[PDB]
């Protein structure tokens, strides 16, 4: 039906908010479906943004769950899965957004939503139901070079296409070239790797591997799937495979492994992005930075370093002696079939 | 006359003392010119070597100056104009053969000092005193590889020779190849420029530059050559230039200077060479060495890094300035002429 397509135009212009109209629709939004920010004006709005729209998307009011734990994560704020406190945050709204029975329900609760949380945060927690909901089956995701280009360019390139989109009518737009090998001078015969590992393409496939295996949400929300502990070896052992064989190619030898975790890291690397989303740049890596203990209250992050350490000497012992220990106290031997897995 | 040609035979075989005779000759040499060692059994000897020569070279017992001062360097110790000590000691000697009135009291003097002083320090005094005594001009001194080889070739060959020359018959000998590219693997790129710094070529132009210009003997003549200064710059700054390009060659960057002494040195270099003459091999320096305080009290060696930097402190300080202060406290101006020298 039409609902599929729908929702893929909440995917267009992320940040813009959802009663602008997307692609050649629009939706009719509730008064109390909008932002507190806009609401006191509504009448203002939903006649000023009306024109140019060819369908106009209607939406129902309905229940909506508890939305105060996928809105505890600020607008402006980055979003990355490897955050102890945003996984509980994420997990949450794919909860959400996965047990709204209806395909109907999906479209309202998500137009409801969609301007009240962070915008990495929804295309991620959106991308996981739709793909793993009955319904929705086969549904072509926009790619998220397209949704969230800052996270793929050199930021300079944006107030190039700002200058470009604004001055120059359509049609007599000149394509802008995105600057390769940039991020760093032939000083650091890293640089040479651009080709590789600034590359759209294994960056986007690196993304949508740990989309369809993710590592938390519940089981049955696809987390377990077939020897997807072996897929997360293997796969990343490829990585590596086919990074030391392009550095052969670069007159550079194999890639030397993070001996330990208190020695310098000898190669810094500044990523020249600007997220538009969190309105700041991504900061750099220092040459012969130093891992520190971490203390980040907000984020629920409280390690030592010698908690990895320790973590580290424990497996290396698992593996030497040839089996593990589950919660229980019972023995699971890492055999030849499922060992790696 | 003959005497030219019976100078060059003190060049052959520099350890192999002066009565085993060299190319088609032998050395008559007086009693009281053996040394202590061998005099004891002067007869066995001077019979046991004198055949299978068309030549027997007379010579004539002098008075001969104290060569305590020459003779104060061990026989098996290494010879460099750099230290202090040895400085005065070659200075010395060179005094002495300078000092020989005739021709033949040149290598009457030479005959005996030959078998007790330093072979490399010998090689270095009467080199110099060839070249600048006023009897023995145009003369052909030998290459100071075929002299001492082992300052120009990988310690490894020298077994292979030996074992070459015992085993083989003459005429059947396989020419002994020299191995290069032999100091660093491919982990160090600085393996690369092998070709330039370990090129016998430019070693030799490099010692015999220091040769003609010494930059202290005695007698200022000898060390005063018209614009020497600017020649000492000028050569050593074209190495510089020629090693740069050669860098680029090689897909390197240009040298780094030495900044400050205090900093590690990040490139070690072990040379690979063995003093058959000291009986030892050369050191090697490793990765991140550190330069350290001198306190060499044999070789007259009392330095503080301090010290250096005071030096090129007050050397800036002149350069900045526009002008030098003499001994006498007088200033004098580095101006476009003679400024550079
Ligand atoms: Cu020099």
Redesign the interface.
């Known amino acids: 039906m039409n609902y599929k397509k729908n929702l893929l135009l909440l995917y267009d212009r992320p940040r813009e908010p959802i009663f602008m109209g997307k692609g050649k629709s629009v939706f009719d939004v509730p008064d109390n479906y909008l932002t507190d920010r806009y609401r006191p004006i509504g009448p203002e709005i939903q006649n000023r943004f009306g024109e140019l729209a060819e369908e106009r998307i209607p939406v129902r009011s309905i229940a909506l769950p508890d939305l105060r734990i996928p809105m505890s994560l600020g607008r402006q704020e980055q979003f990355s899965l490897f955050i102890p406190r945003h996984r509980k945050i994420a997990a949450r709204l794919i909860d959400i957004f996965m047990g709204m029975r209806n395909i109907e329900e999906l479209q309202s609760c998500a137009v409801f939503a969609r301007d009240r949380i962070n915008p990495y945060l929804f295309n991620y927690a959106l991308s996981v139901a739709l793909l793993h909901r009955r319904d929705t089956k086969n549904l072509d995701l926009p790619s998220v070079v397209e949704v969230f280009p800052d996270k793929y360019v050199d930021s300079r390139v944006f107030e190039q296409i700002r200058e470009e989109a604004t001055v120059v009518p359509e049609g007599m737009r000149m394509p802008i070239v995105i600057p390769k090998d940039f991020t760093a001078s032939?000083?650091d015969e890293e640089h040479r790797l651009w080709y590789f590992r600034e590359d759209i393409g294994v960056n986007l496939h690196h993304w949508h591997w740990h989309l369809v295996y993710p590592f938390e949400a519940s089981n049955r929300a696809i987390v377990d799937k077939d020897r997807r502990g072996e897929l997360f070896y293997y796969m990343h052992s490829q990585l590596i495979a086919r990074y030391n064989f392009e550095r052969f190619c670069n007159?550079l030898?194999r890639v030397k492994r993070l001996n330990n975790l208190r020695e310098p890291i000898a190669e810094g690397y500044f990523p020249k992005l600007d997220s538009l989303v969190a309105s700041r740049t991504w900061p750099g890596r220092v040459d012969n930075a130093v891992i520190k203990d971490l203390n980040r209250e907000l984020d629920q992050i409280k390690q030592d370093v010698s908690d990895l350490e320790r973590w580290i000497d424990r497996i290396y012992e698992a593996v030497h002696q040839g089996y593990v220990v589950d919660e229980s106290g019972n023995r699971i031997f890492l055999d030849e079939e499922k060992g790696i897995d």
């Open positions: 032939d000083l007159r030898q």
